[PDB]
RNA sequence: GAGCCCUAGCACAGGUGCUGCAUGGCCGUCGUCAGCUCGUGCCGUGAGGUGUUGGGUUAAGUCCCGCAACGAGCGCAACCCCCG
């Protein structure tokens with residue numbers, strides 16, 4: 721239901737293209753490829769989802785980010801489907817640290833929206 | 838008696854005499870070449886860098902694509918005149 725739904729095909733990826741700080745999450749090497757251990761994915765999903773839940777049930781807002789082409793279409797769907805914002809194409813330099821300045825273009829976007837009709 | 842005009846005296850005028858390395862103003866010139874910058878972010882101990890390195894395209898930093906940058910300004914172009 722959980723970790724049987726995950727073993728679906730939704731774990732193990734890379735192949736000694738690894739960052740060795742991620743060893744605490746790794747189970748073994750099946751066939752040249754690192755197999756991430758789901759019994760510990762279990763663990764972090766509970767902790768992360770606890771933190772997400774909390775966040776939501778108090779007016780919290782979560783910027784979803786994923787630009788790589790496998791996730792592009794997923795992140796937009798799920799993001800619209802929660803009314804949270806998403807970054808999908810390029811992540812622009814300073815969307816956060818320069819948010820003051822980048823927003824000024826959201827304000828331009830809507831003011832150009834306003835010359836549609 | 839005030840304009841006004843000559844005589845002498847007083848202040849002063851006059852100087853195309855010097856310095857264009859004391860200057861203003863205006864002009865030439867590189868060059869109508871495609872450049873030169875800024876605000877915030879980010880990188881760097883720092884000068885500084887990114888933006889404005891790359892690929893394409895244009896008469897052009899013109900436009901596109903890309904990208905720790907997102908924008909903007911002086912330029913380019915347009916707004917002006919002539920010719921068709």
Ligand SMILES: [Mg+2]
Nearest residue numbers: 857858860864
């Ligand atoms: Mg001079």
Ligand SMILES: [Mg+2]
Nearest residue numbers: 855856857858
């Ligand atoms: Mg001389």
